[PDB]
Amino acid sequence: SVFSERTEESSAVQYFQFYGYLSQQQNMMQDYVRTGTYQRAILQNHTDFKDKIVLDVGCGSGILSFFAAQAGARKIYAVEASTMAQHAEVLVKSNNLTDRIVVIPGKVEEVSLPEQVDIIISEPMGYMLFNERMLESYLHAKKYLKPSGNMFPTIGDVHLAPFTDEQLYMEQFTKANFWYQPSFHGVDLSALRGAAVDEYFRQPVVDTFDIRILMAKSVKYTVNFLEAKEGDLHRIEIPFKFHMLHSGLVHGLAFWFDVAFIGSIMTVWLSTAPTEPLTHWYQVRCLFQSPLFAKAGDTLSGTCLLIANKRQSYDISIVAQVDQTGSKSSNLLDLKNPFFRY
Amino acid sequence: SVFSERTEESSAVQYFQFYGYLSQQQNMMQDYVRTGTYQRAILQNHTDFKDKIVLDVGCGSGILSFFAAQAGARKIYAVEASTMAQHAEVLVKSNNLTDRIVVIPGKVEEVSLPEQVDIIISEPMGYMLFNERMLESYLHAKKYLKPSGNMFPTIGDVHLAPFTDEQLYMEQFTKANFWYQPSFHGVDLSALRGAAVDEYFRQPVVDTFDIRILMAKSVKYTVNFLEAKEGDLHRIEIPFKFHMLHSGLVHGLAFWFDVAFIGSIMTVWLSTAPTEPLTHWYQVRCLFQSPLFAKAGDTLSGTCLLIANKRQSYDISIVAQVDQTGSKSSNLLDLKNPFFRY
Numbered sequence: 095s096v097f098s099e100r101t102e103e104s105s106a107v108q109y110f111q112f113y114g115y116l117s118q119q120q121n122m123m124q125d126y127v128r129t130g131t132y133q134r135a136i137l138q139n140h141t142d143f144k145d146k147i148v149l150d151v152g153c154g155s156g157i158l159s160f161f162a163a164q165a166g167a168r169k170i171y172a173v174e175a176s177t178m179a180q181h182a183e184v185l186v187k188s189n190n191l192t193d194r195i196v197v198i199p200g201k202v203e204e205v206s207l208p209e210q211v212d213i214i215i216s217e218p219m220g221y222m223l224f225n226e227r228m229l230e231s232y233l234h235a236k237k238y239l240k241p242s243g244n245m246f247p248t249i250g251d252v253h254l255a256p257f258t259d260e261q262l263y264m265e266q267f268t269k270a271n272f273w274y275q276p277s278f279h280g281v282d283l284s285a286l287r288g289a290a291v292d293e294y295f296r297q298p299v300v301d302t303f304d305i306r307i308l309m310a311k312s313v314k315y316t317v318n319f320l321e322a323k324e325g326d327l328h329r330i331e332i333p334f335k336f337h338m339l340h341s342g343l344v345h346g347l348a349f350w351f352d353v354a355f356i357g358s359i360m361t362v363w364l365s366t367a368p369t370e371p372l373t374h375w376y377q378v379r380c381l382f383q384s385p386l387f388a389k390a391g392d393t394l395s396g397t398c399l400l401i402a403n404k405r406q407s408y409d410i411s412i413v414a415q416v417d418q419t420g421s422k423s424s425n426l427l428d429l430k431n432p433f434f435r436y
Numbered sequence: 437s438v439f440s441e442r443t444e445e446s447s448a449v450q451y452f453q454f455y456g457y458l459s460q461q462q463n464m465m466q467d468y469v470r471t472g473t474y475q476r477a478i479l480q481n482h483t484d485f486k487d488k489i490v491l492d493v494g495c496g497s498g499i500l501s502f503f504a505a506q507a508g509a510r511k512i513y514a515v516e517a518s519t520m521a522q523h524a525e526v527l528v529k530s531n532n533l534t535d536r537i538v539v540i541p542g543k544v545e546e547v548s549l550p551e552q553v554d555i556i557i558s559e560p561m562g563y564m565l566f567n568e569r570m571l572e573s574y575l576h577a578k579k580y581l582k583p584s585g586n587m588f589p590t591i592g593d594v595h596l597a598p599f600t601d602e603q604l605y606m607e608q609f610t611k612a613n614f615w616y617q618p619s620f621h622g623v624d625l626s627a628l629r630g631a632a633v634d635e636y637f638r639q640p641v642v643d644t645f646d647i648r649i650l651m652a653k654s655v656k657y658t659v660n661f662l663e664a665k666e667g668d669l670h671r672i673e674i675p676f677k678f679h680m681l682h683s684g685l686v687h688g689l690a691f692w693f694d695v696a697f698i699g700s701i702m703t704v705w706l707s708t709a710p711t712e713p714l715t716h717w718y719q720v721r722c723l724f725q726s727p728l729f730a731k732a733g734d735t736l737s738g739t740c741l742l743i744a745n746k747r748q749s750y751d752i753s754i755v756a757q758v759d760q761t762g763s764k765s766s767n768l769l770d771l772k773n774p775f776f777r778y
C-alpha cells in the first residue's frame with residue numbers, strides 16, 4: 095500500500111502499539127481545548143453533518159465520530175488501524191449507535207469503503223503540525239471524497255518566529271559539555287564533544303514560553319487540505335523574511351500551528367499559539383548551535399526545509415542569515431527525538 | 437542468529453536506536469553508584485585483568501573496556517550493535533589504545549572473535565534485573581570463554597517483598613475512573629472502565645519508596661552467570677513464602693536486584709535495594725488488582741512466573757494467597773510498558 099511503501103515496518107508497529115493504549119486516548123481526550131474546539135466546530139456546523147456520510151480517519155476511541163452522530167450524520171465510517179478499533183466498537187454498542195457508526199479496522203490506505211462520503215474528519219496534527227506524517231493519510235482519504243466534499247480541519251497554518259532564550263541555550267550546552275571532560279574516571283571523552291553538541295542541538299524543544307521572548311512578528315505558511323496532494327508533504331519548503339523588532343541574540347526559531355474548520359455556518363479555529371490557552375501540543379523550538387546577533391530593523395531571512403523520512407517524521411534543515419551582516423546559522427533537526435522540557 | 441530468532445525486528449530497531457544516542461550513554465555514565473562500582477570491581481581485582489584477554493558485551497561508549505585497560509588487560513574485544521560502536525572507536529583512538537581495545541560492530545550472537553577470552557564484562561541488567569533480555573546475550577557470549585574463565589558480574593540476585601501503599605493503589609482507580617462518565621462531551625464512556633483498570637494494573641511501577649512500606653523480609657532468587665545457560669532465562673519461576681512482620685493490606689510485590697563481582701582479590705557488590713543510595717534502575721512494584729489482608733505472623737505464599745516475550749521483555753504472572761484465610765490474588769503484568777512514576 096501507499097502506507098507500507100512510505101513507512102518502515104519497525105516504526106509502524108511502535109506507532110500503532112502506542113495508540114492502542116487507553117491511557118494515551120485519555121491523555122488526548124483530557125486536553126479540553128482540543129476536544130471542546132473539535133466538538134464546537136462540528137456541532138456549530140451541524141448542516142455539514144445532518145443526514146450526510148462521514149469518514150473519520152484514525153478514529154481512536156471514536157470521539158469525533160460521536161460528535162458527527164450528535165450533529166445528525168446518517169452514516170460514519172470510522173477507520174482505525176490500532177487495537178483501539180475494538181474499544182471504539184464497544185463504545186458504539188454501549189451508546190446505541192450501531193445503526194450510524196461503522197468501525198472499519200485497518201489502515202485508510204488499505205481498507206475498502208462501500209460508498210463515497212460528504213465530509214472527512216480527523217485529528218492528523220502532530221508536533222510542529224507535520225510530525226507523525228498523519229496528514230498524508232488524511233489527504234490519501236480524499237479518494238473517498240465526493241466532488242465538493244469538505245474536510246475538517248480544512249486548512250493548517252504553521253507559524254514561525256525568532257526567539258531569544260539564553261537559559262534554554264545554556265541548558266543544552268551544559269548537557270553536551272559532559273563530553274568535554276579529559277578525565278571522566280580517567281577517560282578522555284573530548285573527541286566526542288562535537289558529536290554530542292550536534293546531537294543535543296538536533297532535538298526540537300517541546301515546551302511553552304512567554305511571548306516576550308519573540309523578536310519579530312510570526313511568518314505564516316498555509317497548507318490547504320482540500321487542494322493538497324499526499325506527495326506535496328514529502329518535501330516542505332518554508333521561506334521566511336523576519337523584520338526584527340528587538341535587538342539581541344537570536345537563539346532559534348519557535349513554531350506553532352492553527353487549524354481552521356471552514357464550515358457552511360461558521361469558521362472555527364483551533365490554535366496552539368503561545369498567546370492562547372495551552373494544549374498538549376505545546377509549542378516547538380529549534381535551537382541554533384551558534385546564536386546570531388541582530389539589531390532592531392535588521393532582516394533575518396532563510397528557509398525551513400522539512401524532508402519526510404520512513405520513520406513517520408521529518409529531517410528538518412534550517413538556514414538563517416542576518417541580511418545586513420551576512421551572519422549565517424545552518425542547523426539540522428531530527429523531529430523524531432524531541433526534548434520534552436515541560 | 438539466536439538474537440534475531442528471539443527478537444521481533446520492530447523491538448530490536450527501537451532498542452538499538454535508543455542506545456545509539458550519546459545522551460542515553462551519558463545518563464547511564466552519570467549514575468555514580470553504577471559507574472564507580474564497576475570501576476572499583478575491575479581495578480581492585482587487577483589480577484583478574486593484568487595481561488588477560490577480555491570481552492566487553494555491549495560496550496556502548498566503551499567505558500568498561502577503558503577500566504579493563506587501566507587494570508592492565510592485554511587485549512579487549514568490545515562488542516556493540518548500535519551506532520554507538522563508531523563513537524567508541526573514536527574514543528579508543530583518542531585515548532591511544534588501538535593496540536589494546538578492538539571495537540567489533542554488531543550483535544555478540546553474530547560477530548566473530550579471533551580468540552577465546554579470560555573474562556567477560558558487561559552491564560546486562562535492566563529493570564527488575566531481567567528487562568531487555570540482555571542477560572541472554574551475556575550468557576550466549578560464554579561460547580568465547582576459556583574453561584575456568586570469569587564473568588563480571590558473576591551472580592545476580594532478584595529480591596521480592598510484599599508492600600502496603602494505599603495511595604499508589606488508589607491512583608490507579610482515580611486514573612481509570614476517567615472512563616466512568618455517562619456524558620463526557622455527550623458520550624457514555626463507562627463500558628471501557630474495566631478495560632482501563634486492567635491496563636493500568638498491567639503496568640509495573642518504576643519509582644522508589646520508603647522501606648517502611650515493606651511487610652516481610654525479602655525472598656532472594658539467584659542467577660549464577662558462570663553456570664546459567666541462555667535457556668534458563670526464557671521461563672523464570674520464583675516461588676515465595678513470606679512470613680508477615682506487619683499487619684495490613686498487601687497491595688503487591690516490590691522488586692530490586694544486586695549483582696556481585698566475585699574476583700580473586702575481593703567481592704564487590706552493586707545493589708539497587710531501597711536501603712541503598714538511588715540508581716537509575718530505581719525499584720519496581722507490581723500491584724495486585726485485589727489487595728490481600730494479612731496479620732503479622734501469617735504466611736503469604738505463591739509464585740512469580742516470568743515468561744520471556746519477543747519484545748525483549750517479560751510477561752509477569754503473580755499468584756498470591758494468605759495461607760491462614762485462603763484469600764487469593766492473581767495478576768498479569770507487561771514489563772515492556774512500565775509506569776515511570778518518579
Ligand SMILES: N=C(N)NCCCCCN(CCCN)C[C@H]1O[C@@H](n2cnc3c(N)ncnc32)[C@H](O)[C@@H]1O
Pocket residue numbers: 097110113114151152153154155156157158173174175176178200201202203216217218219220221228231374375
Ligand atoms: N499529541 C500529539 N503528539 N500528537 C497528536 C495526536 C495525533 C492524532 C492521534 N490519533 C487521533 C485520534 C483522534 N480521534 C490518531 C489515530 O489515528 C490512527 N491512525 C493513524 N494513522 C492511521 C492510518 N494510516 N490509518 C488508520 N488509522 C490511523 C492512530 O492509530 C491513532 O489512533
Ligand SMILES: N=C(N)NCCCCCN(CCCN)C[C@H]1O[C@@H](n2cnc3c(N)ncnc32)[C@H](O)[C@@H]1O
Pocket residue numbers: 439451452455456464493494495496497498499500515516517518520542543544545558559560561562563570573716717
Ligand atoms: N538505565 C536502564 N533503564 N537500563 C540500563 C541498561 C543496561 C545496558 C546499557 N548498555 C551498557 C552501557 C555500557 N556498559 C548496553 C549496551 O549493550 C548493547 N547491546 C545490547 N545487546 C547487545 C547485543 N546482543 N550485542 C551487542 N551489543 C548489545 C546496547 O546497544 C547498549 O549500548
